[PDB]
């Protein structure tokens, strides 16, 4: 929202692809692919006596 | 593309918010909402005495 506001010309960094980012700013190609996904604590397998 | 090549001057229609095409035109705000599933035959698990 700053780079839409003129204060900086071009932000550089982990500024990553959003649908409403791209209406308002004009990225370039990907130069790294990522994705969210869900880190969680190992843990076992089995349930209860049950 | 024949929107970007001003053919047309609105595609009205199924038209889905992909980060290219977002890129290329302008859309709207969602006026619907979508998103991709996968659909497949479901589990006929029989029961019989046979
Ligand atoms: C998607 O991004 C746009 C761009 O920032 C958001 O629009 C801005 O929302 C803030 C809310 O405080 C306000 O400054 C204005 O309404 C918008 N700024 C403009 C037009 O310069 C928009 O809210 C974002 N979408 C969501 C769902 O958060
Ligand atoms: C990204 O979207 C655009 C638009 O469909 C595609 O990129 C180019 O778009 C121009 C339109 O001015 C066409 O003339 C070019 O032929 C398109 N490039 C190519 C290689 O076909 C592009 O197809 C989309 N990206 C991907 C990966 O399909």
Redesign the interface.
Same mark, same amino acid.
């Given at each position: 929202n700053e780079v839409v506001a003129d204060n900086f010309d071009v932000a550089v960094g982990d500024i990553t692809?959003v @649908?409403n980012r @791209?209406?308002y700013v004009?990225?370039t190609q990907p130069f790294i692919e990522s994705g969210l996904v869900v880190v969680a604590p190992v843990k076992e397998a089995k349930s209860s006596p049950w």
């Open positions: 692809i @649908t @791209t209406r004009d990225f």
